[PDB]
Write a protein that binds this DNA or RNA. Structure first.
Ligand code: DGT
Ligand code: CA
Ligand code: CA
Ligand code: CA
Length: 342
DNA sequence: GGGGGAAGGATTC
DNA sequence: CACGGAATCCTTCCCCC
C-alpha cells in the first residue's frame, strides 16, 4: 500500500552557483575540481544543462571541457556551500514526513503513505513540494513518485530536469518488462556488462535464470535485489541513515614514491578530515591512495579505542609506508578515511 | 559447519 | 587527459566454538 516520493535537485552544484550568482542563468556553467598539477588540470564535478547538451558532463577532464565550450563559465567546486544549501532544503522536506531517507547530497526519499491517499494527491503533494522549494531556496527539483524507492527513483530519472512523474502500479508492470536493466539504480557499467553476457537486458529476464548462476556473476545481494524487483515484491523501508565515515583525498602536484614528498599531502588530508569529524571520535583509519594508473589501493587499522590526531598522524605514515612497500607503482592521489565512530 | 570481525578490493551514484 | 565523498557488498583470512 506504500507510496514513495523521491526528490532530486537539478544539476545541483551548477544550480547552486547560479542561485548564488543569478547572472549565470542561461549561460553554460561548469563546476570543476582543479587538481593544480598543471593549468586547468582536473575534472568536471557537474555542469548545468546549457553545457550538458553539448557533451560537457561530470567526469571529463576540464581540458576536454574547454575544447568543447571554450567560452563557458568555469567555476571551482565549493562543497561546503552546496552542502549547507542541501541541508536547509532537506530540513524543509521533513515538514512533509518524518520518514525521510537522505540518500545523498541532493536526493531524499519521503514515505508519504500517511499524508496522502492516492497518486492524485501524491502528484499534488509533489507540486506543493517542488514549488515550495523554489519559493524558499530558489531551487528546481525533479520529483519521482511510485510504490517503492527504486521505482520512485526511476520516475524522477525519466522526468528530469524540473519534472514530476508518477509510475503507478499499472506502469510498474510494464517497466519490469520494457525498462532497460542498465537504467535500474545499482546497475552501473560493470554490472550492466555482466548481465548482458547472461542475456539479461530487462528486469523480467532475471526471473528466467537459475538464481545460483545469477549470484555467481553479480553476487548474492544484487541477485536478490534484481529478483525482488522483477517479481514486484521489492518493498524496503525508509531509514534516516547516519554518517559512518569521514575523509578526504587530494591530488599531488606530481606522482611519487617518496615518503617525504607525499607526507604534506597526507597530513593536509588528515587535518581537513579532523576538522570535519567535529566531536566524533573514530576507532578506525584508512590511508587511501590512487596509483598513477588510476588503480585504488588502501591500508587500514582498527584500534580498540578512539584515534587522537597525533596517533592519526603517526599511523597514517605507517600505513602509507605499507602501501609503497607492497606496491611498486607511483602514487597520484593520497588521502585518509575515518570510520567506526564511538 | 559457521558466527563475526577485520582488511583489501569492487562497484555505484 | 581523468576530482572527489561515502555507502554497500564481495572475498580471503583469522580466531574458535
Ligand atoms: N566531484 C564530483 N561530484 C559529483 C560527481 N557526480 C555527481 N556529483 C555531484 C554534483 C551534483 O550534480 C550532485 C548530483 O549529481 P547527479 O548526477 O545526481 O545530478 P546533477 O545534479 O549533477 O544533474 P541532474 O539534475 O541529476 O541531471 O552531486 C562527480 O563525478 N564528481
Ligand atoms: Ca541525484
Ligand atoms: Ca540531481
Ligand atoms: Ca546506469
Amino acid at each position: 500500500h506504500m507510496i514513495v516520493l523521491f526528490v532530486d535537485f537539478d544539476y545541483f552544484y551548477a544550480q547552486v552557483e547560479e542561485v548564488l550568482n543569478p547572472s549565470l542563468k542561461g549561460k553554460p556553467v561548469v563546476v570543476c575540481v582543479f587538481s593544480g598539477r598543471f593549468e586547468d588540470s582536473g575534472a568536471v564535478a557537474t555542469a548545468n544543462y546549457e553545457a550538458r547538451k553539448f557533451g560537457v558532463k561530470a567526469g571529463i577532464p576540464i581540458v576536454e571541457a574547454k575544447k568543447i565550450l571554450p567560452n563557458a563559465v568555469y567555476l571551482p567546486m565549493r562543497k561546503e556551500v552546496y552542502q549547507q544549501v542541501s541541508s536547509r532544503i532537506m530540513n524543509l522536506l521533513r515538514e512533509y514526513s518524518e520518514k525521510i531517507e537522505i540518500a545523498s547530497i541532493d536526493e531524499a526519499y519521503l514515505d508519504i503513505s500517511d499524508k496522502v491517499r492516492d497518486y492524485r494527491e501524491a502528484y499534488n503533494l509533489g507540486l506543493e513540494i517542488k514549488n515550495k522549494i523554489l519559493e524558499k531556496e530558489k531551487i528546481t527539483v525533479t520529483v519521482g513518485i511510485s510504490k517503492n524507492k527504486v521505482f520512485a527513483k526511476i520516475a524522477a530519472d525519466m522526468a528530469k530536469p524540473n519534472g514530476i512523474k508518477v509510475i503507478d502500479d499499472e506502469e510498474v508492470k510494464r517497466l519490469i518488462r520494457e525498462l532497460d536493466i542498465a537504467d535500474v539504480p545499482g546497475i552501473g557499467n560493470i554490472t550492466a556488462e555482466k548481465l548482458k553476457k547472461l542475456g539479461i537486458n530487462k528486469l523480467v529476464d532475471t526471473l528466467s535464470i537459475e538464481f545460483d548462476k545469477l549470484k555467481g556473476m553479480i553476487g548474492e545481494a544484487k541477485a536478490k535485489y534484481l529478483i525482488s524487483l522483477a517479481r514486484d515484491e521489492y518493498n524496503e523501508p525508509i531509514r534516516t541513515r547516519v554518517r559512518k565515515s569521514i575523509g578526504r583525498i587530494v591530488t599531488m602536484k606530481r606522482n611519487s614514491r617518496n615518503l617525504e614528498e607525499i607526507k604534506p599531502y597526507l597530513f593536509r588530508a588528515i587535518e581537513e578530515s579532523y576538522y570535519k569529524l567535529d566531536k566524533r571520535i573514530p576507532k578506525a583509519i584508512h590511508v587511501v591512495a590512487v596509483t598513477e594508473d588510476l588503480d585504488i589501493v588502501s591500508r587500514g587499522r582498527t584500534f580498540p579505542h578512539g584515534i587522537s590526531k597525533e596517533t592519526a598522524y603517526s599511523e597514517s605514515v605507517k600505513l602509507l609506508q605499507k602501501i609503497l612497500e607492497e606496491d611498486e607503482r607511483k602514487i597520484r592521489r593520497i588521502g585518509v578515511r575515518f570510520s567506526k565512530f564511538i
